C-alpha cells in the first residue's frame, strides 16, 4: 500500500462492481476523473457519444440487455441535464444505473460563477440516491455506495462531483469497495396456501387465461406447458414477447393498441385470469379486466399485489417457482371448447399477418420489412426497438424465441432509445447481431450518434421507417381528434447521411426489392459495417386491435366494410363467431 489518486480509486471501485464502461462526453468538469481511466491496469473504458442523452440511455439499456452496471456522465449544467430522458427511463423501468454529474470546482460553488449551479434538485424526484460530494476524500466511498444503491434499489444513483476532487491523493487504506459483499435473494418459494387457492380457481374455471409479464422471463416453456395442461390461452405484455415461441399455438399476443386481435378479444371473454409477473399499465384506464370473474396474481413485489385489479388470490414469490407448483398441482384438461375457439381465432389472425408479410410486389409497407428481417436475422439476434407506431408493431411480426432479446423504453417511452440500446447491446455482446428498429421521428432525434457505432467498431443494423409523418401520433388523431394539423415533413436522405458518417446506407421503397436489400445490408454488417436501411414506406397504419370493427353486433355493416377495406382485413373473423362455432356464447356481446 501507499498513496493513490482519488480518480483511480473511483475507477478501481467501478471495476470491482463490474461497471467497466462509462458513457458520455469529455469536459473540463469531468477531466480529473477521466484522466484516471486506464493506468495501474484498470480496465474501465470510456465510450464517447455525440449527445449525453444517448450516453445515459446506452448505460441504462446495457443493463436491460443483461449487461453490467452502466455509468453515464454529464458535464456540469447542460451535460448533466442532457441525461434526463435516459435517467427517467431507468427510474420508471427500475433499472440500476450510476450517473455522475460533473461540476465546477469546490471553490466556485455558490459563487454564481460560469456554468456553476446547484444540480441537486435536478434528479431528486426520480433518484434512489442523489448526493453532492462534500469533499474529495469521500468521493470513493460515495461512488461505491452509489453502485451498491443503484443495484439494491433497482434505480438511478446520482453523484454531483466538483471537478477538483479527483485530483486529490489519499492513503490507499482510506478507501474500499463493498462489491465483494454484493448479495441478492435467490428465487423465493410461494406460500402453499396461496398456490392451492389458485389451483382450485383454475380447476373450476370454464375460461381460464394466463396473462404473463416479464416476471415470467426465463420460464416461457413452463408457462406454455401449463397453458397446454389446463387449456388456457396465453396473453403476453408488450415487454414479454421473447418469453414465448412466436409460433406457440395458444399465444394470443398482447392487449390494447400494441397488441394482437386475439388477445384483445380473449380478455373480454375470459372468466379467470392468472396475472403472472406483470404490472400492465393500461389495466384500469382501458378497462382490460372489466369482464373477468376471478383474478389470480403472482408477483415478487408486495407493492404490486392487487394493484391493477382486485386479487382473489395473491401469490408472493418467484413466478418460476409459482408456475411450477401450479403446473404440478392442477388437473389436466383434455378437451375445451374455449381452447379450441381461441386456437382458431389465433390462426385466423396469423393468416392475416402472413398475407401482409408475404406480398410480392408494390409499394413497400413495414409488414414486408419485418418479413425480410425474419428471413435474414440470426436466431439469437438482439432487437433494440424505438417507441413509434411502426416500430412497436414489431411484436406482431418478429418471429422471436427466448434466444432473442427485445427491449425498448416501454413506460416512459422516450423517443430515440433504439440507437443507444444498440450501443449498450453491442458493448455487452460484441459477436452478436444487433438490430435497431427506428421510425423517422425517433431517428431524427438520435441519428448523429450513428457515428458512435462506426467510431467504436460496434456494427449494428439500423432499420429506419420513413413516411414523412409521426404515424402513431397522426394515426390517433383520426380518432381522438376531429382534425389533424402539422404531423408531416420533408424527405431526408438517411442513406446519404449514413454514408457521410462512415456507415453503409441503403434505400428501398418497393416490396420486390426488399429481400435483396436486406441481404446486402446484413452481409455489409457482417463485414463490420454499421448500416442504415432507409425504408421508404407507405402511410398505412397498423390495424387498430383496440377497436375491432368486425362483429356485426358491435358495429354497423358500413363500419365493418370500411374497416376491412382500410386495413386489408376482409378475412378477419370476430371471435364471437369462433366461440359460437364451438357451442359457446359471448359473455358480454348482446
Ligand X SMILES: Cc1cc2nc3c(=O)[nH]c(=O)nc-3n(C[C@H](O)[C@H](O)[C@H](O)COP(=O)(O)OP(=O)(O)OC[C@H]3O[C@@H](n4cnc5c(N)ncnc54)[C@H](O)[C@@H]3O)c2cc1C
Q: Does 280 bind ligand X (CB under 6 A)?
A: yes
Strand pairing class (3-5; 313-316): unpaired
Q: Which does 191 bind (CB under 5 to 8 A by kind): a copy of itself, ligand X, none?
A: a copy of itself
Total number of residues that touch a copy of itself (CB under 8 A): 122
Q: How far is the CB of 23 from ligand X (least distance, A)?
A: 22
β partners of residue 296:
274, 313
Instruction: Specify the stretch interacting with ligand X by CB under 6 A; choose among 124-132, 256-264, 337-345, 438-446.
Output: 256-264
Touching ligand X, residues 295-334 (CB under 6 A): 298-301, 304, 318-319
The piece of 45-53, 139-147, 403-411, 438-446 that touches ligand X (CB under 6 A) is 403-411
- CA proximity to 159, closest of 73, 44, 35: 73
CB nearer to a copy of itself: give 91 or 210. Answer: 91
What lies within 8 Å, CB to CB, of 374 at 6+ separation is 357, 397, 398, 399
Q: What is the largest CA-CA distance in the chain?
A: 84
C-alpha cell at 466: 420513413
Stretch that binds a copy of itself, among 212-220, 279-287, 427-435, 514-522 (CB under 8 A): 279-287
Does residue 38 interact with a copy of itself by CB under 8 A? Answer: yes
Residue 85 within binding range of a copy of itself, rule CB under 8 A: yes
β-bridge mates for residue 437, sequence order: 385, 463
C-alpha cell read off for 267: 380478455
- To a copy of itself, the closest distance from the beta carbon of 417 in angstroms equals 9
Among 30, 97, 214, 330, binds ligand X (CB under 6 A): 214
Nearest to 224 by CA among 250, 247, 191: 250
Between residue 95 and residue 114, which ones bind ligand X under the rule CB under 6 A?
A: 114
At a CB cut-off of 8 Å and minimum separation 6, what does 93 contact?
60, 64, 409, 410, 411, 412
Of 245, 267, 214, 259, give the one whose Cα is nearest residue 93. 214
* Closest separation in Å from C-beta 543 to a copy of itself: 18
DSSP states of 395-448? GGT----TTSEEE---SS--TT-HHHHHHHHHHH-TTS-EEEEEEHHHHHHHGG
Torsion, Cα 471 473 479 484, to 10 degrees, reads: -90
Q: Considering only residues 492-511, where is the footprint of ligand X by CB under 6 A?
A: none
| Binding flag, residue 414, ligand X (CB under 6 A) | no
The angle at the Cα of 65, spanning 251 to 303, to the nearest 5 degrees, equals 70
Q: Applying CB under 6 A, does 185 fall inside the site for ligand X?
A: no
Query: Should residue 215 be labelled a site residue for ligand X when binding is judged by CB under 6 A?
Result: yes
CA distance 55 to 62: 10
Options 328-336, 406-414, 488-496, 548-556: segment touching ligand X (CB under 6 A): 406-414
Q: Determine, following the binding rule CB under 8 A, whether residue 506 of this chain makes contact with a copy of itself.
A: no
Question: Contact with a copy of itself (CB under 8 A): which of 182, 197, 217, 333?
Answer: 182
**Which partner, ligand X, a copy of itself, none, binds residue 332 by CB below 5 to 8 Å per kind?**
none
Contacts of 15 (CB under 8 A, 6+ apart): 42, 43, 44
Q: Using CB distances below 5 to 8 A depending on partner kind, what does residue 275 bind out of ligand X, a copy of itself, none?
A: none
Sites for ligand X among residues 234-253 (CB under 6 A) = 237-240
Please, which residue, 295 or 575, has the CB nearer to a copy of itself? 295
Cβ contact 379:433 at 8 Å: no
Q: Which does 239 bind (CB under 5 to 8 A by kind): ligand X, a copy of itself, none?
A: ligand X
Restricted to residues 461-480, the positions that interact with a copy of itself (CB under 8 A) are 470, 472-474, 476-477, 480
Query: Please, which residue, 301 or 331, has the CB nearer to ligand X?
Result: 301
**219-to-197, 212, 225, 268 alpha-carbon distances in Å:** 22, 10, 10, 26
Of a copy of itself, ligand X, none, which one sits near residue 113, judging by CB under 5 to 8 A according to partner kind?
A: a copy of itself
Q: 205 vs 409, which CB is nearer to a copy of itself? A: 409
Residues of this chain that interact with ligand X (CB under 6 A) are 114, 213-215, 237-240, 254-259, 277-281, 298-301, 304, 318-319, 387, 392, 408, 410-411, 413
Amino acid at each position: 500500500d501507499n498513496k493513490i489518486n482519488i480518480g483511480l480509486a473511483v475507477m478501481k471501485i467501478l471495476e470491482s462492481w463490474g461497471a467497466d464502461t462509462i458513457y458520455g462526453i469529455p469536459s473540463g468538469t469531468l477531466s480529473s476523473l477521466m484522466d484516471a481511466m486506464g493506468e495501474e491496469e484498470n480496465n474501465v473504458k470510456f465510450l464517447q457519444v455525440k449527445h449525453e442523452e444517448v450516453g445515459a440511455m446506452a448505460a441504462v439499456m446495457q443493463s436491460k440487455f443483461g449487461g453490467n452496471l452502466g455509468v453515464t456522465v454529464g458535464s456540469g449544467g447542460p451535460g448533466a441535464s442532457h441525461l434526463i430522458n435516459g435517467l427517467y427511463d431507468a427510474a420508471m423501468d427500475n433499472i440500476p444505473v450510476v450517473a455522475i454529474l460533473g461540476s465546477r470546482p469546490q471553490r466556485e460553488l455558490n459563487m454564481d460563477a460560469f456554468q456553476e449551479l446547484n444540480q441537486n434538485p435536478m434528479y431528486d424526484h426520480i433518484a434512489v440516491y442523489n448526493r453532492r460530494v462534500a469533499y474529495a476524500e469521500q468521493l470513493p466511498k460515495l461512488v461505491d455506495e452509489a453502485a451498491r444503491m443503484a443495484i439494491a434499489k433497482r434505480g438511478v444513483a446520482v453523484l454531483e462531483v466538483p471537478g477538483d476532487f479527483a485530483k486529490v491523493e489519499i492513503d490507499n487504506d482510506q478507501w474500499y469497495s463493498s462489491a465483494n459483499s454484493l448479495r441478492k435473494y435467490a428465487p423465493i418459494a410461494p406460500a402453499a396456501q396461496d398456490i392451492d387457492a389458485a389451483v382450485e380457481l383454475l380447476n373450476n374455471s370454464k375460461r381460464p387465461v394466463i396473462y404473463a409479464g416479464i416476471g415470467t422471463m426465463g420460464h416461457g416453456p413452463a408457462v406454455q406447458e401449463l397453458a397446454r395442461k389446463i387449456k388456457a390461452p396465453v396473453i403476453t405484455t408488450g415487454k414479454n414477447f421473447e418469453t414465448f415461441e412466436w409460433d406457440f399455438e395458444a399465444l394470443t399476443g398482447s392487449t390494447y393498441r400494441v397488441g394482437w386481435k386475439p388477445a384483445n378479444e380473449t380478455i373480454l371473454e375470459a372468466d379467470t385470469v392468472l396475472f403472472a409477473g406483470s404490472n400492465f399499465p393500461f389495466s384500469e384506464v382501458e378497462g382490460t379486466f372489466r369482464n373477468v370473474d376471478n383474478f389470480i396474481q403472482i408477483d415478487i413485489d408486495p407493492a404490486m399485489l392487487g394493484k391493477r385489479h382486485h386479487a382473489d388470490v395473491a401469490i408472493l414469490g418467484d413466478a418460476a417457482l409459482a408456475i411450477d407448483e401450479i403446473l404440478n398441482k392442477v388437473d389436466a384438461v383434455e378437451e375445451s371448447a374455449w381452447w379450441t375457439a381461441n386456437l382458431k381465432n389465433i390462426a385466423n389472425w396469423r393468416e392475416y399477418i402472413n398475407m401482409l408479410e408475404t406480398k410480392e410486389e408494390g409499394d413497400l409497407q413495414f409488414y414486408q420489412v419485418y418479413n425480410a428481417i425474419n428471413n435474414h436475422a440470426d436466431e439469437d439476434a438482439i432487437y433494440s426497438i424505438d417507441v413509434g407506431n411502426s416500430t412497436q408493431t414489431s411484436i406482431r411480426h418478429l418471429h422471436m424465441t427466448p434466444k432473442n432479446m427485445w427491449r425498448t423504453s416501454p413506460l416512459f417511452a422516450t423517443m430515440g432509445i433504439a440507437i443507444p440500446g444498440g450501443l449498450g447491446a453491442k458493448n455487452t455482446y460484441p459477436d452478436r447481431q444487433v438490430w435497431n428498429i427506428i421510425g423517422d421521428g425517433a431517428f431524427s432525434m438520435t441519428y448523429p450518434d450513428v457515428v458512435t457505432n462506426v467510431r467504436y467498431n460496434m456494427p449494428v443494423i439500423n432499420v429506419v421507417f420513413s413516411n414523412t409523418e409521426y404515424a402513431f401520433i397522426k394515426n390517433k388523431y383520426e380518432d381522438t381528434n376531429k382534425n389533424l394539423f402539422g404531423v408531416d415533413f420533408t424527405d431526408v436522405d438517411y442513406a446519404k447521411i449514413a454514408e457521410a458518417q462512415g456507415a453503409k446506407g441503403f434505400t428501398v421503397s418497393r416490396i420486390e426489392d426488399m429481400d435483396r436489400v436486406m441481404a446486402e445490408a446484413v452481409a455489409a454488417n457482417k463485414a463490420g459495417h454499421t448500416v442504415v436501411i432507409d425504408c421508404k414506406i407507405t402511410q398505412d397504419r397498423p390495424i387498430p386491435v383496440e377497436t375491432l370493427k368486425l362483429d356485426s353486433k358491435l358495429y354497423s355493416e358500413d363500419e365493418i366494410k370500411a374497416y376491412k377495406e382500410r386495413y386489408e382485413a376482409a378475412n378477419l373473423v370476430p371471435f364471437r363467431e369462433y366461440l359460437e362455432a364451438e357451442g359457446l356464447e359471448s359473455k358480454y356481446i348482446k
